[PDB]
Amino acid sequence: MKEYDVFIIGSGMAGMTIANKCASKGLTVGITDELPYGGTCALRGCDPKKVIIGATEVRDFAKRLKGSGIDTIPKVNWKDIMAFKQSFVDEMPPKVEKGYKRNGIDTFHSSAKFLSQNTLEIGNEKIKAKKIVIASGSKPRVLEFEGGHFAKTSADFLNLDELPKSLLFIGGGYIAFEFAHIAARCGAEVTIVHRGNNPLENFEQDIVKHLVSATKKLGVKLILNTDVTAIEKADKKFRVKGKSAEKTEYFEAEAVFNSAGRPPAIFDLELEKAGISFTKKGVSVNEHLQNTSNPIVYAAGDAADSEGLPLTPVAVLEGHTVASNIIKGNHKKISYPPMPTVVFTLPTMASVGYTESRARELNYNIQVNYKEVGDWFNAKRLNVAEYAFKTIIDEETQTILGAHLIGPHTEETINLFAMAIKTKMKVNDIRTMIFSYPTLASDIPHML
Amino acid sequence: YDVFIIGSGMAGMTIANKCASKGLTVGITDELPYGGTCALRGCDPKKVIIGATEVRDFAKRLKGSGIDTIPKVNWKDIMAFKQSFVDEMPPKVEKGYKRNGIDTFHSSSQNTIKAKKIVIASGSKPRVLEFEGGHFAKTSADFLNLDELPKSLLFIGGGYIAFEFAHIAARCGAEVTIVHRGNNPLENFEQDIVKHLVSATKKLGVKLILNTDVTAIEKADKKFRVKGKSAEKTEYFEAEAVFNSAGRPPAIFDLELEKAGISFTKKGVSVNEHLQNTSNPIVYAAGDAADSEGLPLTPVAVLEGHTVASNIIKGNHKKISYPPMPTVVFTLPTMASVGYTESRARELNYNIQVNYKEVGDWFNAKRLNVAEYAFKTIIDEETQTILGAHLIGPHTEETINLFAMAIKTKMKVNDIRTMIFSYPTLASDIPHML
Ligand SMILES: Cc1cc2nc3c(=O)[nH]c(=O)nc-3n(C[C@H](O)[C@H](O)[C@H](O)COP(=O)(O)OP(=O)(O)OC[C@H]3O[C@@H](n4cnc5c(N)ncnc54)[C@H](O)[C@@H]3O)c2cc1C
Ligand SMILES: Cc1cc2nc3c(=O)[nH]c(=O)nc-3n(C[C@H](O)[C@H](O)[C@H](O)COP(=O)(O)OP(=O)(O)OC[C@H]3O[C@@H](n4cnc5c(N)ncnc54)[C@H](O)[C@@H]3O)c2cc1C
Numbered sequence: 001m002k003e004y005d006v007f008i009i010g011s012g013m014a015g016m017t018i019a020n021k022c023a024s025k026g027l028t029v030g031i032t033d034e035l036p037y038g039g040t041c042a043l044r045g046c047d048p049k050k051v052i053i054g055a056t057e058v059r060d061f062a063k064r065l066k067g068s069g070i071d072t073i074p075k076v077n078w079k080d081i082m083a084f085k086q087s088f089v090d091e092m093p094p095k096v097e098k099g100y101k102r103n104g105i106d107t108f109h110s111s112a113k114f115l116s117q118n119t120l121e122i123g124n125e126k127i128k129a130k131k132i133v134i135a136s137g138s139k140p141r142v143l144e145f146e147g148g149h150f151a152k153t154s155a156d157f158l159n160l161d162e163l164p165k166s167l168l169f170i171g172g173g174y175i176a177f178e179f180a181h182i183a184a185r186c187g188a189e190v191t192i193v194h195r196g197n198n199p200l201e202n203f204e205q206d207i208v209k210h211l212v213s214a215t216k217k218l219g220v221k222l223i224l225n226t227d228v229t230a231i232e233k234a235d236k237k238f239r240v241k242g243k244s245a246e247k248t249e250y251f252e253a254e255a256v257f258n259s260a261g262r263p264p265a266i267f268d269l270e271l272e273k274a275g276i277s278f279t280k281k282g283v284s285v286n287e288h289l290q291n292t293s294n295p296i297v298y299a300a301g302d303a304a305d306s307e308g309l310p311l312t313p314v315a316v317l318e319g320h321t322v323a324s325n326i327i328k329g330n331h332k333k334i335s336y337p338p339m340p341t342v343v344f345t346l347p348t349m350a351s352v353g354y355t356e357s358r359a360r361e362l363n364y365n366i367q368v369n370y371k372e373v374g375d376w377f378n379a380k381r382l383n384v385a386e387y388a389f390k391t392i393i394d395e396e397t398q399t400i401l402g403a404h405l406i407g408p409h410t411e412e413t414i415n416l417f418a419m420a421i422k423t424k425m426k427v428n429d430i431r432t433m434i435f436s437y438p439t440l441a442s443d444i445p446h447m448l
Numbered sequence: 449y450d451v452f453i454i455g456s457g458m459a460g461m462t463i464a465n466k467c468a469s470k471g472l473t474v475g476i477t478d479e480l481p482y483g484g485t486c487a488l489r490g491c492d493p494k495k496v497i498i499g500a501t502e503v504r505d506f507a508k509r510l511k512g513s514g515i516d517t518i519p520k521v522n523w524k525d526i527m528a529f530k531q532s533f534v535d536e537m538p539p540k541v542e543k544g545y546k547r548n549g550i551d552t553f554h555s556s557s558q559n560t561i562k563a564k565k566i567v568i569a570s571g572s573k574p575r576v577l578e579f580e581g582g583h584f585a586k587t588s589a590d591f592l593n594l595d596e597l598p599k600s601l602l603f604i605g606g607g608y609i610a611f612e613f614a615h616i617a618a619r620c621g622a623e624v625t626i627v628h629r630g631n632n633p634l635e636n637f638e639q640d641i642v643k644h645l646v647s648a649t650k651k652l653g654v655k656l657i658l659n660t661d662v663t664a665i666e667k668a669d670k671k672f673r674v675k676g677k678s679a680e681k682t683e684y685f686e687a688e689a690v691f692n693s694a695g696r697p698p699a700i701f702d703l704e705l706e707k708a709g710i711s712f713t714k715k716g717v718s719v720n721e722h723l724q725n726t727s728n729p730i731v732y733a734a735g736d737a738a739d740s741e742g743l744p745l746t747p748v749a750v751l752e753g754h755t756v757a758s759n760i761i762k763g764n765h766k767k768i769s770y771p772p773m774p775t776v777v778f779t780l781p782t783m784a785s786v787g788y789t790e791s792r793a794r795e796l797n798y799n800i801q802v803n804y805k806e807v808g809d810w811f812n813a814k815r816l817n818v819a820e821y822a823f824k825t826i827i828d829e830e831t832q833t834i835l836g837a838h839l840i841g842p843h844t845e846e847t848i849n850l851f852a853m854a855i856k857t858k859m860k861v862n863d864i865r866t867m868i869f870s871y872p873t874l875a876s877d878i879p880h881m882l
Contacts, residue, residue, distance in 0.1 A: 041871075046871060046872050047811065047815075047872060050815060050872045051815050052514075054510055054514065054815060054816065055510050055513075055514030055515055057506065058503070058506045058507045058510055058514075058515050061502065061503045061506060062503050062507065062519055065499060065500055065503055065526075065529075067525060068500075068525055068526060068528075068529040069497075069499070069500035069521055069522050069523075069525045069526025069529055070500060070503050070519050070521070070522070071519065071520065071522055071525075072517055072519045072520075073519075074507050074515050074516065074517045074518075074519065075516070075517075076514055076515070077514055077515065077516050078514075080512060080513055080514050080516075081510075081513065081514030083513075084510075084513040084514055088811075088814075088815070311868070311871065312871045313868045313869060313871050313876070314868065317866075317868060336868075337866065337867050337868050338867075338868060339868050340868065340869065340870045341870065342870045342873070350870060377492065377533075380533075381495060381496045381499055381533070382499060409843070409846055411870050411873050412843055412846040412847065412870075412873055412874060412875050413846065414870050415850060415869050415870055415873065415875035415876075416849060416850060416853060418867065418868070418869065418870075419850060419853045419854070419857070419859070419867065420853065422863070422867060423853070423857035423859055423863075425853070425856075425857055429856070432751070432754075432771065433771050433772075433852065433853070433856060434745070434747040434748065434751060434770075434771050434772065434773050434774065434852065435747060435774065435849050435852065436774045436775065436776045436784065436845050436846075436848055436849055436852075437486075437491060437745070437746045437747055438491050438492060438495045439776070439845045439846055439849070440846060441846050441849040442747070442849075
């Protein structure tokens with residue numbers, strides 16, 4: 001058969017990071033992906049989404065200054081932005097292929113299961129390897145209710161030839177809200193059906209409520225405390241059944257979307273046939289991101305049950321660590337800096353570090369600064385109605401435990417709270433800092 | 449009075465409000481409405497107007513790529529929008545001053561009303577241009593008060609305001625000229641970066657005239673003819689309005705400084721480490737009015753305020769300390785800098801590593817269809833910390849502050865590389881720049 005130094009399942013951010021890193025320290029590298037090389041982020045995730053959001057920002061901005069110095073609000077041309085998006089998606093796989101060829105990396109284009117501890121079924125073949133890496137990331141949750149198969153994926157949303165006239169999103173996290181915001185701004189009826197009491201349960205609700213507000217003003221119907229129990233095909237539309245505490249509601253839309261959590265993409269690998277430990281949260285890893293059982297097996301990114309948030313940069317960070325323990329031997333212990341996250345709605349919400357309740361749960365002595373500040377210059381000049389913050393400061397050290405933002409540019413500003421946390425910067429050293437002005441960053445000293 | 453303050457600017461307001469809260473008697477005077485250059489005739493009103501232009505600019509980068517129509521700026525309606533900001537501010541300063549037992553006065557020897565300690569916070573004024581016809585040239589405040597936009601505009605200058613205003617006017621549909629005396633525009637800034645703003649500014653339909661001294665302005669009908677001499681010719685330039693964009697001397701030359709023995713230069717009131725005058729020790733200065741190590745920025749005016757306020761309140765216990773002072777040119781694309789230029793870090797004999805790159809191909813420049821994206825970082829080799837960073841492209845006005853925090857925190861290069869940033873964002877390009 002073929003022996004390999006490293007064999008990697010999936011050429012995503014974690015797969016690319018290890019493949020490139022190991023191949024340039026001389027090792028023989030075999031990588032396989034069932035889909036074109038790139039990963040969820042580059043082809044069907046963050047990048048394509050952010051491109052699309054581009055044109056909506058133009059529309060949103062023109063709308064905000066209407067009759068305040070702008071007369072015509074542009075309508076988004078759905079056709080042209082998909083093509084623009086596509087030029088980014090189409091270029092990335094050949095770009096990762098070009099690099100794999102220039103690095104002595106064997107490209108395989110087939111799915112992968114374990115046959116044994118150190119062997120894999122790649123199409124027909126039977127590739128053994130010295131160290132094997134699981135970097136499969138996560139997949140859409142299979143909806144286990146009558147009609148579940150009618151619910152299109154996130155990938156399908158980003159590949160729409162035409163924008164449907166109405167869209168329902170089954171979910172209550174970041175994807176449901178980002179895709180609702182895009183759909184509505186491009187001129188469709190949108191509904192969001194979420195099973196929980198609170199949308200974006202993970203985020204500080206004193207921030208989330210302002211996003212719910214903006215989301216209603218946009219013409220997006222938020223349905224809470226509802227389990228979808230069916231999807232039926234009524235002509236070329238869909239009739240969605242939802243059950244709440246007593247009553248039953250039906251909802252019609254030209255397209256229904258699966259916006260649920262994403263389980264780790266590890267359940268079809270025949271893990272058990274290789275003695276590899278796993279949970280419902282993904283591949284079980286130790287402090288070296290080495291499997292807790294089979295020590296030839298490493299995992300990184302969404303496919304690993306780590307303390308890492310399911311974020312592109314985390315997948316890279318975990319990538320550098322796995323590749324290091326492979327190339328040199330188990331020396332490096334994974335260390336997480338702050339993990340800032342963004343919901344790419346307009347207005348954006350951003351969060352880094354602990355929530356109020358999380359910091360109390362950990363018995364930290366805290367100070368809380370929450371403030372709605374829509375009347376601050378930065379919100380008023382851009383005519384953005386929702387601007388609010390919540391900062392969590394440790395009373396003992398006078399450092400930041402966490403920051404939670406909604407308003408203009410929070411996706412950027414959240415990174416200054418990230419750096420303040422990582423550098424253990426005292427609250428008074430941020431207050432007396434000089435920022436460029438007028439800028440959103442320059443409001444940070446007023447948030448403390 | 450305990451404290452008497454000349455000018456309710458950012459420095460004036462800061463010292464006034466700070467002293468008044470500790471139980472001191474406070475007297476302040478301006479001459480114009482209370483607020484200062486930034487709030488009423490500077491940064492604030494300028495940023496409001498730039499908003500409308502960002503819409504037009506953005507709806508045009510994505511022209512044919514998801515946007516079909518490019519909106520025209522309504523000069524009247526954004527003036528009105530700008531004016532609502534400016535008009536509501538001075539009554540808001542009264543409400544603060546009155547709610548703290550501060551005496552408001554609205555008029556222009558050693559300590560002559562007399563008071564125990566006196567503060568000079570007069571800020572800066574437009575340079576009086578002293579050539580035949582200099583008076584025709586309107587102030588930058590007048591640009592921000594224009595009822596109507598002229599059809600052509602000429603800017604005498606090579607600094608941030610000349611370019612910021614040229615960008616606005618061009619985007620609003622006007623033929624625009626910059627006449628600069630110097631060899632290079634924006635001389636203080638890294639030229640490896642400035643050259644990219646030059647490129648974009650010409651692509652905008654702006655004529656940049658270099659190495660030219662303006663010798664006259666002549667007013668024929670509702671036009672003006674500007675005369676300009678180089679090493680060769682005396683080229684002439686015609687425009688419905690000419691603007692004074694030349695540099696702002698400190699606003700102290702008409703206060704009769706010599707009548708109080710108070711040290712000054714042409715660069716402003718001479719101050720010590722306490723921001724107390726090097727001669728008269730009853731006199732403190734803050735802002736554009738002080739010849740301090742502080743750049744002429746709003747936040748510097750505030751920082752200098754809090755030091756003067758503290759030395760006055762408890763006695764001379766605090767020596768002014770400057771953090772990194774990031775500055776921005778609010779053109780599109782924006783230009784940003786903080787800390788040392790390459791040549792300045794060499795002048796202080798730092799052993800330096802320099803990272804430059806033009807990166808208009810990177811995802812963040814490419815997805816926004818911004819052609820100009822470049823950076824230049826200056827790293828001290830010994831400590832592996834950032835001495836300076838210099839940026840042009842999308843969001844540099846926001847991103848430059850991360851370089852500021854990195855410098856203040858003596859953050860090692862490798863810890864910026866290992867940081868996790870929100871993605872996709874402009875901030876997440878920082879570790880690639882390093
Ligand atoms: C719509 C969407 C938007 C997102 N937006 C953001 C955002 O803005 N910011 C952010 O930080 N994160 C975002 N994320 C998350 C981000 O995409 C992931 O955290 C990151 O891409 C995980 O990368 P990975 O390397 O772990 O997996 P991926 O990068 O997805 O790579 C896994 C690869 O494995 C392949 N594969 C899977 N199973 C097998 C198998 N059995 N055999 C062979 N190949 C297999 C897949 O085809 C895929 O190419 C988003 C995700 C989605 C879905
Ligand atoms: C067009 C422009 C754009 C700018 N943009 C920016 C920017 O984007 N970012 C930034 O950080 N900085 C910017 N600045 C700089 C900023 O305006 C100043 O640094 C800031 O105003 C400093 O405040 P100050 O207290 O020193 O002066 P000011 O607040 O300007 O001065 C206070 C007041 O003193 C008054 N005064 C003058 N003489 C007398 C007198 N004899 N008696 C009584 N009162 C008097 C004046 O009327 C003035 O209103 C800009 C400046 C201009 C002109």
